[PDB]
Amino acid sequence: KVYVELQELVMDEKNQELRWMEAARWVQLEENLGENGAWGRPHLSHLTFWSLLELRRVFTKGTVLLDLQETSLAGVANQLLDRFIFEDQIRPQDREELLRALLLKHSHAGELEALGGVKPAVLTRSGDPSQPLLPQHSSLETQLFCEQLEKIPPDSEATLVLVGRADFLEQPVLGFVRLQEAAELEAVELPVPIRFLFVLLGPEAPHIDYTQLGRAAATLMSERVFRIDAYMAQSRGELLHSLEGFLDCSLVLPPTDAPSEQALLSLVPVQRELLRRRYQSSPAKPD
């Protein structure tokens, strides 16, 4: 298995300084970081329909830097922004601010209580952190699992998911990076080398919650089939095909006013068949 960490750009409460704070982590089973400063009970990842829809939209036009010869967040960010501009995904004027935001201090649970917590933030055209304008929604995962690391194998490689909001952006942008050699970055404190980097930047838009987008990306990375495809992928098309299979094998549960265990357990054959379909194509077999 592998370690996936999701970090969201947020503003501290003591000095109003924006920074990156880990919001969730995955070792197969997902943990979330509550406002208290402790990790909630780990759980199977569940995604919202809008998050997966927007993830597919951004990935279809995303930026991929495979077998990239870099070993530092600074160089990775430089190359990623350069290819973003080359792909007309961000304008040259945005590069300075986006780079400034990316190489900010990445804080973790060890400084949440030391600091004054973290509030959501939106990067501004200037060097100041804006306040989100769209209505906020307290994370469902934090409400349901949090209000109350040895599992990483020695030879596993980690993945970093960065989500941030920037009002000075035309549309959401996805940047996917696979380093040629796994490297240790200051963003992740754990002594696990990083192989993949998800970068999800963009403005405030309806039906897009960048936390849910990051959760969807992290769940996709945590999936064995998609991870194997990503390791062996030499083009964006193969990653897109793996994502299409991942969505083909997903099960959408519509809202119901009369939930029950028996009705829900009637979907056991469906879930089994979907997992079988997902693992039929990948080299891996289902555990």
Query: Which residues contribute to the site for a second copy (CB under 8 A)?
Result: 29, 41-53, 140, 143-145, 207, 219-220, 223-225, 244, 246-275, 278-279, 286-287
Q: Which is nearer to a second copy, 91 or 151 (CB)?
A: 151
Q: What single-letter DSSP state applies at residue 104?
A: S
Q: Looking at residue 183, what DSSP letter applies?
A: E
Q: How far is the CB of 233 from a second copy (least distance, A)?
A: 18
Cβ atoms of 103 and 72 within 8 Å: the answer is: no
Min dist. Cβ of residue 262 to a second copy (A): 8
Instruction: Report, in Å, the least distance between residue 11 CB and a second copy.
Output: 27
Calpha distance 259→121 (Å, rounded):
36
Query: Which DSSP state fits 109?
Result: G
Nearest distance from C-beta of residue 30 to a second copy, angstroms: 9
Which residue, 114 or 252, is less far from a second copy as judged by CB? 252
Handedness of CA 281, 152, 28, 208 (dihedral sign): negative
Is the Cβ of residue 51 or residue 211 nearer to a second copy in the bound state? Answer: 51
Whichever of 31 and 94 has its CB closer to a second copy, that residue is: 31
Q: How far is CA 212 from CA 44, 110, 137, 206, 207, in A?
A: 15, 23, 11, 13, 10
Task: Please compute, for residue 4, the number of CA atoms within 13 A of its CA located in the half-sphere on the CB side.
Answer: 27
Q: Minimal distance in Å, beta carbon 53 to a second copy?
A: 6
Among residues 107 and 222, whose Cβ is nearest to a second copy?
Answer: 222
Nearest distance, CB of residue 192 and a second copy, angstroms: 20
Would strands 118-120 and 129-130 be described as parallel, antiparallel, or unpaired? unpaired
Q: Give the separation between CA 206 and CA 175, rounded to whole angstroms.
A: 21
Q: How far is CA 106 from CA 103, 188, 242, in A?
A: 8, 8, 30
CB of 77 to a second copy, least distance (A): 29
Inter-residue contact 159 to 195 (CB < 8 Å): yes
The residue among 38 and 267 lying less far from a second copy, judged by its C-beta, is 267
Measured from the CB atom, the residue of 116 and 283 that comes closer to a second copy is 283
Question: Which uninterrupted H or E stretch holds 65?
Answer: strand 63-68
Distance CA 125, CA 97 (A): 7
